Design a protein around this ligand. Structure first.
Ligand SMILES: [Cl-]
Ligand SMILES: [Zn+2]
Ligand SMILES: [Zn+2]
Ligand SMILES: [Zn+2]
Ligand SMILES: [Zn+2]
Lengths: 396, 246, 396, 396, 133
């Protein structure tokens, strides 16, 4: 991985720095690294692609080196380097694609393709140089087993889940009490509804709770908490629990009461925020516990009093809500996120070449299934393919 | 012998040199890395001001690679030489250390040699074409030992007048070469266009070679003479001579 | 096999002993053996896989020797040795997997994979060194036709069979006499039941016998014998012998009377235990004869006398039992047991790569089917694959 | 850890090999390693701390080297070596104890005691030599991020839980349908009971399902599956789910029908076994789904038909069962098993010196609580303490 | 701040660029900067404070220079550099944490922790290099 990353980085630096008119002092070290790469790859035969529709490609390297004494690079030097750069870029792109389309239950972190396995030989270690990207840095630290993490903007940590729970119900679904939530990406919208508006509840307070377990520990996370769940704020017709029938929801939004957000790690309360909205910080957690309450307004204007009678029928259903968006976080494991394109790259490569479904990843690289069952083996293979995808995107 | 390895049975004509095989067959990082450099330290080609130039690796120019050499042979001084007689082993190791302990002097020597090469190569006007010549220049390795063991720290660089003289000689030779090519081509083309079918281009080629001042024409193979005739025939005439002929 | 085991053992020793900072005197002999391995394996081409989903893999060996002089091993030595060891361990794992998934009716003890067949040549005998494992030791001893012994904790010697025999029965299944047993793994539970409680039996004693024929001779066996068979001591609705109907069993457990456990070899009584419960030793046997009597209590309290009337109906059915557990044993042939993982390893390797059912082993390596028909060819193939599995387990 | 294990291994080898009369050629390398340890440890001051009741102990090393002059070791040499080895063994045992009684939430895999933290310096790397034990091998593999493996006999993977679920219930508990299970250690006994014997079932079939989620992925597992559940096959008086009353269970065991044992990994069916009893192999799994059915016998003898009437009261309650024992398995994470004594050693050391409860482990070193909430921090700390326990047991 | 940033940047560059097998030309300037940092920090005592539950930590610097004279970096070089880098990274992280938890009403832009105040002395200005973030 480090050798493949070094190949890609050398080629990117060759494209960027080997330009017409540049001082040779600007590229002396880069030219040395490029010539080392040519020297190491020369005389080696590579084969990439025998899986799905990825065609069998054979790579031979017999390229000449680059000059080292001129003062300023000219068009001749760049023309000489460009053909080698193109061939090497094609080779690296195909190696990255070959590695991205492979998985193993036993050793998912080890190279799977024949080409990357050959590049793990000792003789290719000479190609290795600066490993400065975030993903390669994490790769090396994690190989050494050092505390390292990835920074995500809008981490895709919650598998899709639109569900409801009815604590009070009956076959006619006319006097209900419960919670409905959407868990999607970095967003949690939860809404606790009481059809009776807590007329008969003790102290006229009804308590709703929502517990979300994250499949990986998020650290140094910035969260936006808002007191309304706009997703569950309009009339809906909702399938029953078993799909036997449909029930009617007619929300009237009351502000949530006694809002408490607890960020817990292994059942230990790490962060607690009471009646706090806006930006909050969750330093280290794997579980989110949202506790809110519906309180009857002790004083109601005539229209408000008309909304909530003493007994049934209940035509307007009192709802409180919360919205929790993870703006950014840090996680020791790789995740899909709104900023990076690693998951998109891997999925695109797998789909374009009809890669047969393996024994590790869900078919079609579905992220909801992947994050629902994010096992250590899946984490290993996902880190491998994501690092390869970043390496490839460095050039392609 | 240092690493206890079986002596290499090198087969002549092998596409790999003995060092290229030893690089794969030796696991020690110092010696293997030095062997890798030695294997891959060929001349690089670059066109400067329209002249092809054979340039050295930047590690040769700054003399840094000598450190690796030292590293490698320092490891050779520590080796056991499993089955070697201890007196001969000691002598080899002490010679290895004789060369090793001159690391600074050898770095200076490498930088000096590379700098002199670059400076005098700046004064070359004809392409530095690399071909394996029929006859070689014999280099005694005792002279290499003398240079390695006697070089001090007095920098010597080509004098500006020496550089100008070298450049002038190169320019004069190149200009004379081109002018005599032009004369030969003009006379051959004129004889052909004048329909002088009994004219012998061999005499023209011999005169051309004589005017180059560095060829003993009595020893030029006939096939090469006729090849020179053909190549001269294929060239186009120079504008001034062609206009006068017109 | 000995060459493959020697490769695996050398690699295991290299992993364990070639570590940073260790004295070279600790590995001098190991380094010589490792270099001998490198010399012997160099310049040889091997191919593995091609059966089931096991992928085809080509191996070429061109490695330098370790000859660096040191007092204590450093990072360079360890890294070079690590690269070589990684390649060799991958090769050995693939060879072991290839050999595990193959079988032959004729000469199943001989190598099946072409890689192992090539490794069985004389030129590779140099790789051979210390053979200290139990399985390789037994392999070598059997090659010499010396006595071999595999020591098993809870040997899996009895194929699963939950059966019953009705010595007296009728369509109503209301006055039955017989025995029901479970022979599973190392455990034998047997229960002789009489519905009449020997009211009309000679001397008010009923006799039950259970003969269990072991498929292989067991020696130096530690057995635990307990009076009661807890499996056949609760009410039970059992199917008819032909499944046409179902009968009812309502045990009332009486202690077994005149218990004799005979451990027989070729029909000759080797060990005999009379009314002895607890830990007993069977030194050499291939058959177990459990003979026990149901004795009607001569004197009964009114509650006891109520259970056993003179004539039908018999609502409570007298039952005597015996439990026999082989805690440990020694067998010349290989077997599954509770402490080892060779059967599990072979089955996992065959299931993972979808190996087609071969001409020797039953589908899915069902142990019950294998031990029921533990033929000599099956025994040879099983020993081969178990030895290869242990060799692989040394590394993977 | 590697240095501490190397010290312990050197001392064990010295005890085993430095014996009266032994050739010096039998100990030359061992003597060299022991003297290297003496040189490395000489001049260093260590302290084992006073956490709990562990006495604070100070250790100084000023030992002379072992001799090299005797062709055969004699009594004087053995006595001098014994004195030195006794001091070193005391030091190593105290260091191991000091490490076992410590835990960290942040970095549990790193050394917690100051002695082991000092031994992690570079100057002590010289002491390092052969790492051949399973636990140290796995430690080294984990440090390099390689596939680890611990082989357990009867792995203690199921936290103790004796529970029941009533799918059909009523206040008087006379017409019940549900399941009761015991998941203890490596054993799962489950029993589905129907009081009506599926008289009113849609097809005279009552489906029971038990899902056991393993806290860690198990591989290469040999599993004994038996039809009946002897634990839930006798009359019982069982507290109600809320403890308000007690109900009566009067099982009559029927053969389980359509038994499907599924071994799932990430929700995917890795292994499936239909009506197969005896020894089975689960190659890789983290969940067990046992599906069985109580089928009303289509044909019944008069007594069997007498047991099961068409309506209440139901005095005999039909029951089907299943028993599942994990004889052996392989897990990447450490676990307690019936063979190794690591958990017992750690617990004994903690109890002997009255170590105060830390922030990681349960406040008794209780295995049920630990394996229940087997967090990654708990796993790291457990691996550290178990490795140290094995190191100590090499000597003590 | 600039000196602390330069320490962190040098350590990050050392971790990224000092990798086994890499050409020394890829790290020549980096090795010079790292040796300059080692020379500057050697012989200096630092203490990260005990504010809150943040532990009091004492840091002493006595490290040898990173080697030159390798054509391609080997495993021994990387191991030695990793030991030094680990100690320096731990020191830098602790100093950053100590500075992050302190504040003043006036002169709040100036360093607050004793470690960063010491690092703001002239004798540490040598450590300063590229400030690109
Ligand atoms: Cl057991
Ligand atoms: Zn509903
Ligand atoms: Zn029958
Ligand atoms: Zn056991
Ligand atoms: Zn109940």
């Amino acid at each position: 991985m480090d050798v493949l990353y070094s190949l890609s980085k050398t080629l990117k630096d060759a494209r960027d720095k080997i330009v017409e008119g540049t001082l040779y002092s600007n590229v002396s070290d880069l030219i040395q690294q490029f010539n080392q790469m040519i020297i190491t790859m020369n005389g080696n035969e590579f084969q990439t692609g025998g899986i799905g529709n990825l065609p069998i490609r054979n790579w031979n390297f017999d390229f000449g080196l680059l000059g080292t004494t001129l003062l300023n690079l000219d068009a001749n030097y760049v023309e000489t380097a460009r053909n080698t750069i193109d061939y090497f870029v094609d080779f690296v792109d195909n190696v990255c694609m070959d590695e991205m389309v492979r998985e193993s239950q036993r050793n998912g972190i080890a190279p799977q393709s024949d080409s990357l396995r050959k590049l793990s030989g000792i003789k290719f270690k000479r190609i290795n140089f600066d490993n400065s990207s975030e993903y390669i840095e994490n790769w090396n630290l994690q190989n050494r087993r050092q505390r390292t993490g990835f920074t995500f903007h809008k981490p895709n940590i919650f598998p899709y889940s639109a569900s409801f729970t009815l604590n009070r119900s009956q076959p006619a679904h006319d006097n209900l009490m419960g919670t409905m939530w959407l868990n999607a990406g970095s967003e949690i919208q939860v809404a606790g509804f009481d059809y009776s508006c807590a007329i008969n509840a003790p102290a006229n307070i009804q308590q709703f709770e929502h517990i979300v377990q994250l499949r990986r520990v998020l650290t140094t996370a910035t969260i936006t908490l808002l007191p309304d769940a706009e997703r569950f704020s309009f009339p809906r017709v909702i399938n029953s629990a078993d799909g036997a029938t449909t029930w009617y929801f007619n929300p009237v939004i009351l502000r949530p009461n006694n809002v408490e957000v607890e960020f817990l790690l292994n059942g230990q309360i790490i962060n607690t925020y009471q009646a706090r909205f806006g930006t909050i910080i969750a330093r280290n957690f794997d579980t989110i516990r949202l506790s809110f309450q519906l309180m009857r307004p002790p004083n109601m204007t005539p229209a408000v009093a008309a909304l909530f009678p003493n007994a049934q029928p209940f035509e307007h259903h009192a709802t409180v809500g919360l919205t929790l968006r993870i703006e950014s976080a840090v996680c020791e494991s790789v995740l899909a996120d709104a900023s990076k394109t690693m998951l998109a790259n891997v999925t695109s490569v797998r789909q374009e070449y009809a890669i047969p479904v393996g024994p590790v990843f869900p078919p079609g690289m579905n992220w909801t299934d992947l994050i629902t069952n994010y096992s250590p083996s899946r984490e290993d293979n996902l880190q491998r393919v994501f690092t390869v995808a970043s390496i490839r995107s460095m050039l392609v | 012998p240092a690493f206890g390895m079986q002596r290499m049975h090198y087969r002549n004509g092998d596409p790999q040199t003995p060092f290229q095989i030893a690089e794969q067959q030796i696991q020690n990082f110092q010696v293997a890395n030095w062997l890798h450099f030695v294997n891959n330290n060929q001349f690089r080609q670059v066109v400067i001001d329209g002249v092809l130039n054979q340039v050295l690796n930047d590690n040769i120019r700054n003399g840094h690679v000598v450190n690796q050499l030292m590293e490698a042979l320092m490891q050779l001084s520590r080796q056991q030489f499993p089955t070697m007689p201890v007196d001969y082993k000691r002598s080899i190791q002490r010679g290895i250390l004789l060369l090793s302990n001159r690391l600074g002097q050898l770095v200076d020597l490498t930088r000096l040699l590379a700098y002199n090469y670059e400076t005098l190569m700046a004064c070359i006007t004809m392409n530095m074409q690399h071909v394996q010549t029929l006859t070689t220049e014999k280099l005694q390795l005792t002279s290499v030992t003398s240079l390695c063991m006697l070089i001090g720290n007095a920098t010597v660089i080509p004098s500006p007048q020496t550089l100008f003289h070298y450049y002038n000689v190169n320019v004069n030779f190149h200009s004379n070469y081109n002018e005599r090519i032009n004369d030969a081509v003009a006379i051959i083309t004129a004889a052909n266009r004048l329909n002088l079918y009994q004219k012998k281009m061999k005499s023209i080629v011999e005169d051309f070679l004589k005017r180059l001042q560095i060829f003993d024409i009595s020893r030029v193979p006939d096939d090469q003479m006729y090849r020179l005739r053909d190549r001269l025939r294929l060239l186009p005439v120079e504008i001034r001579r062609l206009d006068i002929f017109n």
